[PDB]
RNA sequence: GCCUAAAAUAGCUUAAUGCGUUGGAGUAAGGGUUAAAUCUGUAAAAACCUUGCAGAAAGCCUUAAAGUAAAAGCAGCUAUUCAUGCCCAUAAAACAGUCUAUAAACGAGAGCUGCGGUAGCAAAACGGAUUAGAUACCCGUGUAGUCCCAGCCGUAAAUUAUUUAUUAAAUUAAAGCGCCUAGCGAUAUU
């Protein structure tokens, strides 16, 4: 029982982050444009966020 | 590549400081394995020569060390 | 899975630069996954000059992409790689499939249940 | 922005997955017929059929890869382990032997 | 004339020693070994032969202008540390010392031992 | 096995080595 | 007295792209340091390792100290500081 | 080399291995186009000719061209070995046929374009391409084995065949079975191309080539059981130079080989070159085969002159 | 969910080295020995700064192997396929054993056939020395081979006999086998 509460709290989870999701071309273009305007600094410098899934 | 640094013209001391990073950083290492080639089963037996010339002098300054302690001989 | 790929690009303008990341958008939309993070970090000074066969590259721009897709993208990805000669370096690595485990899951739960039990 | 549950679905799903899980997943499906109750992974009627269901798999696999030799000796190992466990259902249990026999259409060839 | 830096390479390999004298763009103006000051086969392996080369080395620089160098070691062995004091003493200033000593990361299988 | 045990046979191994390559490229073998 | 990062830090950073955390697992000359000086697991060992060599393949490291490369001392503090000032006026 | 050991293995698959049945079939080696798709009947009607046997003779009606003649009908393919034709338009395989006048096969391509009928080409086949398959060139074109592109959109590891010397004129460097050709470098206005027999050479930039190789890979695994298995082909015996009389060879003599081996006009044949010292195209070859630079060639004889 | 010196498959990186390699600068040696010489150069070498091309191997981490991969064996990076190992949570009312007469598969290095490749090292071979002789050890060149793919060969000083109980080991008592009966001596016959 718990383990199927533990699984529809994950799914809640992913519902908010998939805001930012971009699935298709127009959104593309869009994220694209905004990342080269807005360039960050490298791991040179300051240490980055390593990814650990979603 | 190793930088040392000539101040007031001692060079001798930056001689000396070659030789350390010589050592510390493994290159008269290098150098002695490719001098000439031996194999893995060889390779072996030479290590295991070098490691118990380590070991012995350890062993023999553990016994004046003790020495030491106790009796407190300036040396 | 999820795959993240780190590329270095020759210092070129913002048109080049869209135009490759462009091609690795598309098709990971074409096999049927999704994109979650983009991002660029301008021209950085590399520890060692690249070289081509006749070219010396001291410096590159960098730009990163994390997506979700079916295993077969990888060589998808690299092809396209290869293909392009704006791009001199690429790397592919795979990352963890969730942020959190069961078991931090089942603490989660536990703790609101003992809440509302005690409420 | 909106949400997009029809992309959290494909992630949870078992499409971007290796292939090893999703034929695992198949094969748990498969069973769901002789197993004794809803939560049975053990009982000598599942063993088998998992075992079946794993060789058949199998065959497509080293059609292609034909040097991967590693492999193949796992698969021969359990294939003589499936014929002693057949051998002791007949001898003992006959009624769960038939069962197993007539579900997965093998033949009558177990005795000792 | 005289406010020339220069840059000394100094090669040594186990059997001899060599001194090669350049400008800071690498265009060689002098050089020295010991077979070129009188020193042959069994003998160019005494400190003596090398102290004599490094004197040579050091008399030519001056007469070019080349009063401060810097000297860069390539290899093990004993032979530098005689050609580097010869240098100081002859009248040329060192400003540093660097060791360019190559290191294989794997590399190409060495020729075999010596029965002896 | 000692290391007088395997000199022992090392001499039997050469002579038999020896015939076999002679015999290699002849029409009739000495035997 | 040298700064030490926790076993936490250390799983939560390992990665190639932080070229500037992984400096401390170094020797000056650029050398991997053995774990009875680095003082971690045996899988944080295996992790730090890999991640210098994958650095190293993509350029962002260099297997040894280059006479070529000096000024990057130099051009690090010099985009260092200018970071530091956008953020701050930001 | 073959081997007798090689045939009584009979492990290579798309080879026929004939059983020793007769003296004429113990040691041939065929091709077995079934099992690998190959179409062996008739080429299409608008794209052959059926033609005369010349049999090495000129239009004077001497022979020119030695043991040669007495073979069976002849049929040529005409075949489009530049796509500049049909650049925008893809074509679709429809078979893949072997042809007795060259060493690799040929595929057959059908196109429609829009407003028009289809229309039917020969193309010389890759080497992974079968029926279905879909060929395209030009620019906006993918780099996959059988497109045509120019060298500009080229990687420089991709091996390419059937490379252009002229910008227009057609391939006709890299034909021949199973070969192929790689690109180290490229210039301002040229390309540094290594061809199949080891030569680097300079290219222009604007012409054109095919990705991937040449479509038979079993071309040096076959063997003629027969003397007339070749004359079948179209080729006759020819007679040892020592086995004549003085007066039709340098070596007709009694005598084996009195003088250096030489061709029957009295020129040196073992290793004496034959390629003019001042050739104009000596400004285009970089280094010859077998790695000698093109100034050792062209500047041999006159520093000995000197 | 993660990990892997496991296997198969496919992409990528270069410290050093070699050259009938490019340009600049420069001029007598370089290489090697107990001591010498053959050899490479002065018609422009080695050394120094640059250009091009190529093969093999994987510094520090790195240590046993503590993986034990069944044994043979196994660590440059990334990914796929697949098999293990770790945590956390589950599952079986009847089934699963030890050993091997006989039979099969896997199997270092060397060697053989075909195809591609050939830097470094190096049987054979050819020279220079040492020596009463040197047919060896030493020095200079150097082909097969070492490398890739597909086949053949099935041999090593190719690990401690296997299993149950006890045991840190050990020791004690049992279950199923293989081998030995003084040495010496075959290309016996099949
Ligand atoms: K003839
Ligand atoms: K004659
Ligand atoms: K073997
Ligand atoms: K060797
Ligand atoms: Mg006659
Ligand atoms: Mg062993």
Known sequence: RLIKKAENLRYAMLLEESRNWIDSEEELEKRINQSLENPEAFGFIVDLPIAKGL | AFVAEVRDGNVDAALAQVKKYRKTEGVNDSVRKKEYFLRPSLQKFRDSELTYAKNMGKLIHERVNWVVKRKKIKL | ?119 | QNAKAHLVEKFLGPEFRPRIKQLKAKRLEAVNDIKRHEADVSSPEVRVSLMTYRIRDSIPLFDECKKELTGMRKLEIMFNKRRRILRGLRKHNFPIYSMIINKLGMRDIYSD | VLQLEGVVHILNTSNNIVLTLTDKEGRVKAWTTPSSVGYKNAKKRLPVAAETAAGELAKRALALGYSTVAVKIKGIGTMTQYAVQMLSSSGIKITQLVDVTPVPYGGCRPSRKRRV | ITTMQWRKLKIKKHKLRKRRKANRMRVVKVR | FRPRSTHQEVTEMADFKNVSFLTQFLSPAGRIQPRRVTKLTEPLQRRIAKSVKLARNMALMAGEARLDKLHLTRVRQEELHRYQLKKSVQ | ?306
Not at chain 3, 13 to 26: H, L, P, S, T, Y
Request: aromatic residues 8%.
């Open chain 3, 1 to 119: 899975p999820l795959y993240e790929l780190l590329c270095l690009a020759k210092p070129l303008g913002k048109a080049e630069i869209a135009g490759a990341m462009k091609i690795v958008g598309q098709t990971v939309l074409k096999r049927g996954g999704f994109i979650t993070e983009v991002q660029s970090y301008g021209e950085q000074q590399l520890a060692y000059d690249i070289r081509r066969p006749f070219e010396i590259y001291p410096s590159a721009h960098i730009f990163k992409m994390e997506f979700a897709a079916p295993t077969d993208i990888v060589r998808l990805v690299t092809h396209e790689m290869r293909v392009n000669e704006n791009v001199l370096r690429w790397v592919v690595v795979r990352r963890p499939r969730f942020k959190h485990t069961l078991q931090e899951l089942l603490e989660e739960v536990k703790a609101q249940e003992n809440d509302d039990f005690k409420a």
């Open chain 8, 1 to 306: 080399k073959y081997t007798y050991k090689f045939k009584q293995a009979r492990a290579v698959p798309g080879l026929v291995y004939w059983k020793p049945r007769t003296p004429g079939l113990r040691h041939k080696i065929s091709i077995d186009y079934d099992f690998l798709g190959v179409y062996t009947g008739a080429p299409h009607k608008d794209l052959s000719a059926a033609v005369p046997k010349l049999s090495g003779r000129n239009n004077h009606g001497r022979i020119t061209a030695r043991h040669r003649g007495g073979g069976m009908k002849k049929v040529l393919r005409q075949v489009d070995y530049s796509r500049e034709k049909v650049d925008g338009i893809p074509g679709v395989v429809e078979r893949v046929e072997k042809d007795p006048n060259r060493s690799g096969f040929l595929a057959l391509v059908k196109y429609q374009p829009e407003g028009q009928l289809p229309i039917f080409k020969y193309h010389l086949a890759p080497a992974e391409i079968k029926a279905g398959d879909v060929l395209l060139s030009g620019d906006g074109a993918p780099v996959q084995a059988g497109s045509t592109l120019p060298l500009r959109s080229i990687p420089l590891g991709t091996p390419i065949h059937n490379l252009e010397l002229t910008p227009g004129k057609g391939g006709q460097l890299a034909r021949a079975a199973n070969v192929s050709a790689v690109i180290q470098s490229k210039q301002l206005e040229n390309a540094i191309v290594k061809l199949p027999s080891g030569e680097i050479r300079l290219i222009n930039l604007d012409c054109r080539a095919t990705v991937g190789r040449v479509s038979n890979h079993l071309q040096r695994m076959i063997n003629y059981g027969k003397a007339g298995e070749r004359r079948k082909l179209g080729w006759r015996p020819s007679v040892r130079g020592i086995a004549k009389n003085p007066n039709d060879h340098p070596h007709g003599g009694r005598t084996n080989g009195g003088r250096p081996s030489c061709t029957p006009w009295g020129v040196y044949c073992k290793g004496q070159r034959t390629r003019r010292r001042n050739n104009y195209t000596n400004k285009f070859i970089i280094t010859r085969k077998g790695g000698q630079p093109i100034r050792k060639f062209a500047e041999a004889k006159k520093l000995k002159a000197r």
